[PDB]
Every structure is written in structure tokens, then in C-alpha cells.
Design a protein around this ligand. Structure first.
Ligand SMILES: CCS(=O)(=O)c1cccnc1-c1nc2cc(C(F)(F)F)cnc2n1C
Length: 394
């Protein structure tokens, strides 16, 4: 009897995990392959440039619009379900992707990136929130958030070089239309599978110092990849004259230590459940080590190992603090997971919204090693700030 319904429920819950993680994979593929495509119109590819604030405000339009939406879309995920705002996010992401494949101007690209911001808020917060919801127990919550962040890192690291070599071979019409078709197939498959209490407000999560220090951790761990992603792809030619094939391929061996860091902290959170603050702090420590060591890496292979240490550190901090964030709102607040991952994406959003607007300007004014040592100083001075979470078992 009951074994059949239980294995069917675990089957459908694993299917929802796979469909949500593939949704996050394809969505981050969108956000990180439109970046080498945008400067080619407005007048072996590598994503970013460092010039033209008018284009940089387009690159940060996604992050500033999710920064403006998900404080209002946090309680939207709390009031309604998770599957309906995930469908709203994937629907506006389909509309965004066919708006990329539809036109080529500045205003339409700005509108498509803004719709990617709206879909980032809705779809990304709903996806991470229902991965936290459908895995209430802690060693499966950490492992499912690990698979989530592993496919997020897949779509954000190994997807931009192949998206670039599809833009150089096929173009922009056919790849974005078929990727929007695969995204609508994923959304309709989650409609076929999923079939879609009072909640705490978003103000009261900021008054919780534990949620506030995890939000500061996510801001300060995202801020090195925030300021270094529009910047390294012009520091290459200034430093060591990196080839264009070895240009956007620099984040491509940074996925393997990301998934090794994810696996390492899933192991060290299933073995040590109430010691995730130490792996968040150690993640921030190796973040500050990598950001301190990047301008010392004047050859290509040490730059690759420094950026893979950077993705290793963001993997440790994200996979050791996003289960801590849901566990923390579970044991200290009501057990609704939308607002607290809206706070997580607020941290993500303020990082990637201050990145492409003023990052290139403060590199052109101060320098590159000054910015890198500033962020490494921030992370070496913020890794002993995660010590406040030592009483999460108490
Ligand atoms: C090194 C981390 S990464 O995955 O490889 C990555 C690489 C390049 C650009 N961005 C990301 C990236 N980091 C995220 C963290 C979160 C969350 F806060 F939820 F943990 C959500 N989305 C993320 N994305 C898309």
C-alpha cells in the first residue's frame, strides 16, 4: 500500500527538483549569453565590456529591476503558492527571450533585460523557495540546494562560451527562439507535473539580525564576481595579451571547483549540521584570498585557478548559507520560504546592480588591483562577521 504512494510522491518531488533546476540552468544561460550579444548591435566570444554607462545601465537593468520587484514579489510568493509565481517568472522569461530574438535596438534590448529582471525575481526566488519547501529535512535541503546551485553554476559558467560559439555560428534568431521553446517546454512540463500560513512581511526579516547577516554575506560574496565580471574581460589584454579563444573560456574551468565546493559543503553539512557558519566564513575567506590573488596572477593558468577558487568560495557561501537561511526562517520565523530568498536575491541584486554601472568607472579611476584588494579587504574583514551564527543549533 503506502510504499507505492510514498515512492510516487518522492518521484514527483524529484521531477519538480529536476524541472526547477533545469529552469534555473536555462535561465542563467539566458542571463549570461545575452551579455556577449548586447554590445554587438548598439552602435569564441567573451561576455563583457568595460565602457559606455548607457550600455552598463542596460546590463544592470536586470539586477536593478529585480531589486525593485522582489521586495514586492517576496510577499507575493508568500501569499500565493510557489508554482504560480514560478510560472509567472517563466512566462515573462519566455516573453523576454523572444523579445531578445525579436529586435535589435537599444530600447527593446533594455526592455528584454528588464523582463529578465522581473523573471529573475519571480522565477529564481520561486524556484529556490520551492526547492527549500519540498525538502523540509535538513540533509536533503542542503543536498537539493546543492543540486540547485550546481545547475545555476552550470548555466552561469559553462553556458556563456557555448552560447558565444552559437552566436558566432548560428546567430541570435534561431538560438534564442529554440531556447525560449525549451523554456516554454520546461514551464509546460512543470504545469503537467506540479498542477498549480500567513507569512512574515519583508520588513520583519531585516529586523532579524541572523537573516540580516546572511544577507550581508550574500552581498559581500557576490560582490567580487559582481565587480570582476565586467572587468577581467578588459584586464586580459592589458595584462598578458590573452587570445580571444582564451578570453571567455576563463570561467569555463571554474565550474568544476564550484561543483566540488558544492559537494564538499553538502558533505560537511550532512556530517556537521549545525556548523554551516564555519563553511560560510571559510568560503568568504577563500573569496578574499582569490580576490587578493587575482592581480598577482599575470599568467592565464593562475588566473583560471584564482577564478575557480572564486567560484569555489561563492559555492561554499551559497550552499552553506541558503540552507542556513531557510532553516533560520524555519526555526525563528514562520515556515514560508518566499520572502527570505527574496532577501537572498536582494543581496544578489544589489551586487549585480552596483557592478556593471560603476565597476568599470572605479577601475578606470583607481585601478584594478586597488578594486581587487578592496573587495579582498571586505571579505577578509567580513569572514569573522559570520561568527554570529554559531548559536543556530541553540
Ligand atoms: C560562482 C557562483 S555561480 O552560480 O557560478 C555564478 C557565476 C557567474 C554569474 N553568476 C553566478 C550566480 N551566482 C548565484 C547565486 C545565487 C544565490 F544567491 F541564490 F545563491 C543565485 N544565482 C546565482 N548566479 C546566477
Amino acid at each position: 500500500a503506502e510504499e507505492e504512494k510514498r515512492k510516487a510522491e518522492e518521484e514527483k518531488r524529484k521531477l519538480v527538483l529536476v524541472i526547477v533546476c533545469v529552469a534555473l540552468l536555462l535561465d542563467n544561460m539566458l542571463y549570461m549569453v545575452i551579455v556577449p550579444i548586447v554590445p554587438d548591435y548598439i552602435a569564441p566570444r567573451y561576455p563583457t565590456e568595460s565602457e559606455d554607462v548607457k550600455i552598463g545601465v542596460l546590463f544592470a537593468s536586470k539586477a536593478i529591476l529585480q531589486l525593485l520587484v522582489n521586495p514586492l514579489s517576496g510577499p507575493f510568493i508568500d501569499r500565493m503558492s510557489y508554482d504560480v509565481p514560478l510560472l509567472i517568472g517563466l512566462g515573462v522569461m519566455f516573453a523576454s527571450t523572444v523579445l531578445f530574438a525579436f529586435a535589435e535596438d537599444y530600447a527593446t534590448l533594455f526592455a528584454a533585460r528588464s523582463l529578465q529582471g522581473l523573471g529573475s525575481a519571480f522565477a529564481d526566488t520561486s524556484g529556490i523557495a520551492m526547492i527549500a519547501d519540498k525538502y523540509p529535512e535538513e540533509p536533503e535541503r542542503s543536498r537539493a540546494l546543492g543540486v540547485a546551485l550546481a545547475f545555476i553554476s552550470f548555466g552561469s559558467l559553462v553556458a556563456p562560451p557555448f552560447g558565444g560559439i552559437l552566436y558566432e555560428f548560428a546567430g541570435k534568431r534561431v538560438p534564442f527562439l529554440v531556447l525560449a521553446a525549451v523554456s516554454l517546454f520546461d514551464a509546460l512540463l512543470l504545469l503537467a507535473v506540479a498542477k498549480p500560513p500567513v507569512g512574515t512581511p519583508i520588513h520583519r526579516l531585516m529586523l532579524d539580525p541572523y537573516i540580516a547577516v546572511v544577507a550581508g554575506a550574500l552581498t559581500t560574496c557576490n560582490i567580487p564576481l559582481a565587480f570582476l565580471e565586467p572587468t577581467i574581460a578588459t584586464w586580459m589584454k592589458h595584462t598578458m595579451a590573452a587570445s580571444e579563444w582564451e578570453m571567455g573560456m576563463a570561467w569555463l574551468p571554474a565550474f568544476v571547483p564550484h561543483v566540488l565546493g558544492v559537494y564538499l559543503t553538502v558533505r560537511l553539512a550532512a556530517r556537521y549540521p549545525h556548523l554551516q557558519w564555519l563553511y560560510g566564513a571559510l568560503g568568504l575567506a577563500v573569496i578574499g584570498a582569490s580576490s587578493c590573488i587575482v592581480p598577482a596572477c599575470r599568467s592565464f593558468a593562475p588566473l583560471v585557478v584564482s577564478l575557480c577558487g572564486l567560484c569555489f568560495g561563492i559555492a561554499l557561501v551559497d550552499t552553506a548559507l541558503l540552507p542556513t537561511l531557510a532553516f533560520l526562517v524555519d526555526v525563528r520565523h514562520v515556515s514560508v520560504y518566499g520572502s527570505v530568498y527574496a532577501i537572498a536575491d536582494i543581496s544578489y541584486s544589489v551586487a549585480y546592480a552596483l557592478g556593471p554601472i560603476v565597476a568599470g568607472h572605479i577601475v578606470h579611476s583607481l585601478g584594478f588591483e586597488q578594486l581587487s584588494l578592496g573587495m579582498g579587504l571586505a571579505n577578509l574583514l567580513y569572514a569573522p562577521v559570520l561568527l554570529l551564527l554559531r548559536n543556530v543549533g541553540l
